[PDB]
Amino acid sequence: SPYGPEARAELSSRLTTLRNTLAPATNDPRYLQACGGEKLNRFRDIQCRRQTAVRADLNANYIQVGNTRTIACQYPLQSQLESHFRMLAENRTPVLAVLASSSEIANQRFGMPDYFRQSGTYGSITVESKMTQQVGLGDGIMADMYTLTIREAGQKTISVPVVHVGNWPDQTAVSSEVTKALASLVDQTAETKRNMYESKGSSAVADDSKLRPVIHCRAGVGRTAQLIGAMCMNDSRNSQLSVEDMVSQMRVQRNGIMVQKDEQLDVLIKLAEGQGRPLLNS
Ligand SMILES: [NH3+]OCc1ccc(-c2cccc(C(F)(F)P(=O)(O)O)c2)cc1
Incomplete structure (x- = not known):
């Protein structure tokens, strides 16, 4: 089978090699470096590809998978919120999808500021949060939606739609259907x-x-x-892009950990299989 255990084993072999070779060295020229004392990376081992970095003081990357163009980032640190909101505004962000759970955000040990469900002021930027609709995705997984209205004296005011999945636990894969x-x-x-x-x-x-x-x-x-993998498969422009391609593009454009669990890779495989999309490059 093109989707059998042999093909899957080969796919994993290729992707593991790529992960291991993309691991960051100290002062790695491939990865964005912190400057001046302030922490850049939420996690030391989860770094931001320099070539595709969005801002010098964010762990955030431009990602293009086939034809699908997105920004993937870490949950912004408290000290990064002004820059994060500037990135959001400047990009005219048409949707901010937050997949960190409500339990994670509320746990102050994790330092994940509640920046989209509450209004706030961050330097010269003020942010107004309004709750909009709530959408069920299946299997009890819920999307809560918000708008963030971003203001700054002398800048155009920009509003950003937020889709918050608040109950997708860390290091798990929601089902192919929910995805x-x-x-x-x-x-x-x-x-x-x-x-x-x-x-x-x-x-x-x-x-x-x-x-x-x-x-x-x-x-x-x-x-x-x-999510990015699924979005790429929902884009009609990406006919014939393999799962190997998709994952290898995310990894080279952000870091080697992209698609962190086998069960997450398995959901991409199952979505591929449903479409008759190849797993491997020939
Ligand atoms: N230190 O080894 C690599 C390493 C370190 C940390 C993490 C990690 C930390 C927090 C959360 C997650 C994660 F849950 F995988 P997410 O879905 O938020 O990307 C992953 C994943 C890989």
Whole structure:
């Protein structure tokens, strides 16, 4: 079988080699480096590919999987929130998908600020959060939606739709069905917001660094990578892109941990199989 244990074993062999070779060395020229005392990386071993970095002071990467353009990042540190909101505003972000659980955010030991469910002030930026609809994705998994209105004196005010999956636990894979429902919700939300900008003649529409969905979980490598993979498979432009390609693109463009659990890779495989998409490059 193209999806049998042999093919799966080969896929894993290739991806493990790639993970091991992309592991960051100290002062690795492939990875963004902290400057001046301030912590950059939420986790020492989860680093940000230099070439695709979004801002010098964020652990955040531009990611293009086939034709699908997104930003993947870590959950921003408290000290990074002003820069994070500037990135969001500048990108005219059409959807911010947060996959870190409510339990994770509430646990102050993890230092995950509650930045999208509450209003706040971060340097010169003020942020207003409003709750909108709640959508069930299946298997009890829930998406809570918000809008974040980002203001700064002398800047255009920008509002960002948020899709928060609050009950996808760390180091797990939600089912292929839940994943497909989630990808559809996130793409639909982005599409609506992107259409508003287009209807207003925004110049962001012509700029491939902009209007990217922004996706983060805690580290930005497990749950984030499962969602990005699913989104890529929902994009009609990506015919024939293999699972090897998709995962190898996420890893070279962010870090080697992208798709963190075997069960996450298994959901990508099952979605591929459903479409008759190849696992391996010939
Ligand atoms: N230190 O070894 C590598 C390493 C270190 C930390 C993590 C990690 C830490 C927190 C959460 C997660 C994660 F749950 F996989 P996410 O889905 O948020 O990316 C992963 C994953 C890999």
